[PDB]
Design a protein around this ligand. Structure first.
Ligand SMILES: O=C([O-])C(=O)/C=C/CC(=O)c1ccccc1
Ligand SMILES: O=C([O-])C(=O)/C=C/CC(=O)c1ccccc1
Ligand SMILES: O=C([O-])C(=O)/C=C/CC(=O)c1ccccc1
Ligand SMILES: O=C([O-])C(=O)/C=C/CC(=O)c1ccccc1
Lengths: 283, 283, 283, 283
């Protein structure tokens, strides 16, 4: 499978979206799993999940790697509401447009906030919920905020450069030897190709600070069976938020990977793929 | 499979053990997995693991559910050293006696301490290590000690009664409806059948307090791939010890079950069996 | 100072209170400090704070040890709303009735919930806020709930007995040698004297469960300078809630006493008195 | 009081120190309190504690602000043993040289490690122990290591520059408006004046990594009454280590300041001074 062979576009119409262009990459034809990426500069569905799409398709799922509004090849946007909710509306718009009745959701960081908001707003449209270090869940009981990684994420948004991208990635990943020229150049190309996304994200952050993303108080509403994953060494979203989710969602379990930053699906791809596929099949 | 059809005995000879009788239950004939039980009154291999033995045997393993010294049908003993280490020596004695070169270990509570000590003392004789809320790992950062469950465990040892057994089990299990007459009577029979074990455990606890079981300082020695499981609602061993293990063992991962006490292999048997079998096969 | 010489009554009129009798003990004549007790069977202002009233009066404060509605010598009541808020309304009623414009509040456990609700509802009427292990602040990130102490509190409410009172107190206090016959008999007399309070508390708990007391989401509203105290060994309210308060209240500090249960003002009275008096004078 | 008027030197002779020059600043003449600074580039006694020396002297103490070996105006040194222990030996050498029988110790970060090692090695020579976010106490249960602040500390040691110093200080302090030109230039002058200290610290860190400083296992030996302080927002040493100390030292208490980095004695100087002076007088 390749980015080019899987690349598709769909115009969505949902709440404050009118003929809004959403890019996604699709492979497979069984039960739909939508995978949702984080909010760092240059993020997109394919680069976030290219170690997972193949195994999930082999397991018999239809995988949609969605570009969230204001990222990658999806349309530019300035949001005045918290991104989790807006992104979630875009997932519903995509699903309606493609006649998908129900989807399993996989979401890391911002994508985890998206998946949470979706499970809250559209409970009849979600199957199972897989959350990898979701962002915006309020203060940590131990970690000073903004977290180290978030500071670097802001700095890259405001002053984008190849060196700052590398600094960010070194914080993002536990194992530094995963940062090849291919990963760096690829992410750098996504940033260079869409400078408008960077300035818009910063404007959006002014209109709706991270505190506005905190849906903690509503977690008890979630009826989806939930699989929470965390990197032990995540410097972007605090480990104790894995416990917050585990205590507040009805049917949840928590899996924490050692020697792992925010990108468990990349750093521990084999174990991640087996666990989540097993959860989707049998939980 | 039944307790009676699987029941076996072997005399062990290791360090301070001479012709010491060890009871165990064995089924299957592939790779050996030894499963080790907790230290509560009436504990034994078969009752601790009777929801897991079948699935593991179906997966192709040879399962040995071991009675630790001073429990169930194994010989009576008063230990002056911490139980984890003494139990571990008994596992080595059993393995030598049965010509088992290497075993995967599964250990809950006291059995988790046993498995840890084994991995430390006999690294060449362990495959993978599965730890379910191991006891004796020093103070908690949050939980006052002795933990609620430990107080009840002591009270049952000192003043054994059917009502006190029921109180203990209600604390042991998250889901109270799992406490059937069959579970209660069975555990009660094990207590009635071997009163000597109860008095000996209390004597042993005087000679070697729980503080003496703490092997935290040596966790960095463990080279076994390790799967740590915890019940979110464990009132016997503190949840933050799952983090302690995850930070200090080289290759570890942590899985926490919601709505689960100390007995994850019983309360969440299906998920537990799938996760651990997958870990043994693929990690 | 004695309970009898300080004992006073006042009829209050506030929201759902009409000619409702509030008992309190008052000494001193400077700045008013109102001290608010926990919700255990037989609790009251004088017994909760009799090691603190003298030192605070010597420091120049007017101390009012308030009996909350449905406790001690205050009127009986069945509450259908969370107790923190109802208690807080009663504090306002007392203050209006006595022409007290502003008070410093000291609150342990339920009394801490009372003080929090007061700071939220009547910000113009509070000086400084002193919180000792306040109850009802939602789930713990580490402690299974109901906490051990809460289970005993329920059992004493439902099946009051001298032995069960002693069991509760042994959990309540770190240092068991503080449980003299005088403390036990005194608390027992308060329970025997007002059986109606016990049945009413249980009825109230059915109408408004502990989950309904959780004011976490509003903590950011508190403008009072806040001093949070915790017992390290508190088995009633979880230590991580001290962090929850410290992260969410604007101007807070946290002091944790070693070898201390829920009753820091009793177990560490000298240090407690010096710290809080210093805070009231200088913070 | 000024740095110049208080500045003194003494040659020490203790274990591996022979005629080793120690600089310190001394004022007052009552009970001796020795204050020990952190290990960041340009650290020294006077700059670390210049908001505390006056109030402590006014309270009646003799204050010695010690420069640790390899810092400020004390002699250069390359250490092959963990710095806490070596620094502690230097404190004993200073005390012997000055005929001080017993001292109260105040230690932040590295200075907290120094004070801990001193309390362990020379229990007969310490009064009370005041610890402000001591470093080197092993892994955190929540914080990835090296902590954000430590990474910046290394970067400043390796590539010293005024901009990198400012970056470090912005992380060091919660309130950025405390970073005046005076603080920056002063710290910068200390770095420029002694480049040898920077290269030696890095060499020492290679010979004795931070893991070698971990004295956790011996904390139970400490008989000194201990006051542990932490900044809630400390990005150099993890907040859960405050709990580690509180659980493992016999007579300890923990005070956590909101809106505070590693430098509580500077950011919350008034409250810090009152608390510690009160502790020294009355605990
Ligand atoms: O690949 C990415 O999207 C990435 O590098 C970082 C994402 C961070 C992120 O989504 C985040 C959002 C809010 C709070 C914390 C974290
Ligand atoms: O089935 C059992 O063995 C049981 O009920 C409890 C075991 C507790 C246990 O092994 C334990 C030992 C040390 C510390 C904490 C827990
Ligand atoms: O003296 C007392 O009031 C006492 O023994 C216990 C009080 C517990 C209490 O107020 C509480 C309320 C809600 C949640 C946790 C704790
Ligand atoms: O003023 C200073 O010394 C400073 O900026 C930082 C000190 C950090 C420090 O002593 C430290 C040492 C080991 C581990 C963590 C922290």
């Amino acid at each position: 499978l390749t980015e080019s062979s899987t690349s598709k576009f769909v115009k969505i119409n949902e709440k404050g979206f009118s003929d809004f262009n959403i890019h996604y990459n699709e492979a497979g034809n069984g039960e739909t799993v939508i995978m949702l990426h984080g909010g760092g500069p240059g993020a997109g569905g394919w680069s976030n999940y290219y170690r997972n799409v193949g195994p999930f398709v082999d397991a018999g799922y239809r995988v949609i790697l969605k570009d969230s509004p204001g990222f990658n090849k999806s349309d530019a946007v300035v949001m005045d509401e918290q991104r989790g909710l807006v992104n979630a509306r875009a997932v519903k718009g995509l699903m309606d447009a493609l006649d998908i009745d129900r989807a399993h959701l996989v979401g890391n960081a911002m994508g985890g906030a998206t998946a949470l908001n979706f499970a809250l707003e559209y409970p009849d449209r979600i199957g199972k919920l897989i959350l990898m270090g979701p962002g915006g869940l309020g203060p940590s009981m131990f970690a000073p905020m903004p977290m180290e990684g978030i500071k670097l994420l802001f700095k890259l948004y405001a002053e984008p450069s190849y060196e700052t991208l590398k600094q960010m990635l070194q914080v993002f990943l536990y194992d530094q030897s995963l940062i090849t020229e291919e990963l760096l150049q690829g992410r750098w190309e996504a940033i260079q190709r869409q400078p408008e996304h960077l300035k818009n994200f910063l404007i959006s952050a002014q209109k709706a600070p991270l505190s506005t993303w905190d849906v903690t108080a509503r977690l008890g509403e979630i009826k989806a069976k939930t699989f929470i994953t965390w990197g032990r060494d995540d410097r972007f979203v605090p480990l104790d938020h894995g416990l917050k989710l585990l205590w507040n969602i009805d049917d949840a379990r928590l899996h924490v990977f050692s020697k792992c930053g925010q990108w468990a699906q990349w750093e521990h791809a084999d174990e991640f793929n087996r666990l989540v596929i097993d959860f989707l099949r049998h939980a």
